[PDB]
Design goal:
alpha/beta; Chaperonin GroEL; seven-stranded mixed beta sheet; GroEL; 9 strands
Amino acid sequence: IVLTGSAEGMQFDRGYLSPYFINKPETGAVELESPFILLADKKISNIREMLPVLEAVAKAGKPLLIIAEDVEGEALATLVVNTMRGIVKVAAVKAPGFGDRRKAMLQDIATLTGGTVISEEIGMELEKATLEDLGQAKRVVINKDTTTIIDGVGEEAAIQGRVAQIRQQIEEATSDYDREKLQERVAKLAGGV
């Protein structure tokens, strides 16, 4: 059966890491306009390692959505103070899923948003991250249980390439479970373009 979205966005089952990120009190949601998106495959221990990019986003005057493994209490507190005071507008959420699928989906988001997953495994350092490594989207909406990325700015051809890769994986899948999970990633990408 045919659908009808056109602006649903790419959504995943992770909500805000702090209630203080909420900026739509009537709905209990976080709505960020024209945000930068930081993606990392690790836990954020101290905010200091993120100061360069954080300072850069502040100067740019755009909000920042942080998608990482988790944010330590101390670092989260720092993000909260800064955003409450209006120094830098931010919201943080955990990366979708787990294990290898989490890595794949983090990449899906990076491709959709024109961002780069900051991973030490490939020689990257959060402290060395710059604005070009960040993804972007028209808007992000976060609530207690989910995150929605609307209109990722990624290259059309790159997004198509990622979708093509998944289609091949579906053909190579050896179980319905794996195929359905792969198809779900296609639907997520399709909702974000």
